[PDB]
Amino acid sequence: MPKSLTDPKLLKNIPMWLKSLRLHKYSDALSGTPWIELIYLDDETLEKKGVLALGARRKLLKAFGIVIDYKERDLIDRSAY
């Protein structure tokens, strides 16, 4: 469900955004990257950011391309940008 994964409130709070994934722990190394520069990463590059775990980066590839499937079409709440 996209509400809490496509939301300005979460998209600018990497910790509570990653909490929708039940991860919420990469923010220690990843909150310096806003969702708009972020979702554009990949498998192994999230890991150079410190997603030092496939079942965090692949789970992020989920999180990313759902928001991509709305962002690449301007369907987000417009204040997330």
Side-chain angles (χ1 to χ4, degrees), residues 13-79:
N13 287 325
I14 296 311
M16 47 186 266
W17 188 85
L18 294 167
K19 191 172 281 261
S20 73
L21 327 184
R22 314 309 178 218
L23 295 171
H24 65 261
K25 63 76 57 66
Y26 299 94
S27 37
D28 186 69
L30 203 134
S31 291
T33 310
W35 76 283
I36 202 76
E37 295 189 89
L38 192 74
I39 63 187
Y40 285 178
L41 306 157
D42 199 6
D43 179 46
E44 213 190 313
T45 303
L46 280 169
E47 181 164 83
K48 312 308 153 165
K49 293 280 195 165
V51 184
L52 279 144
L54 174 74
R57 50 201 158 91
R58 165 179 182 182
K59 283 303 178 178
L60 257 70
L61 282 3
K62 171 215 82 154
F64 291 175
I66 273 73
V67 66
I68 296 180
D69 199 49
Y70 285 109
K71 168 280 192 264
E72 197 235 82
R73 25 287 320 284
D74 196 64
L75 311 185
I76 313 300
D77 290 279
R78 247 63 63 96
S79 302

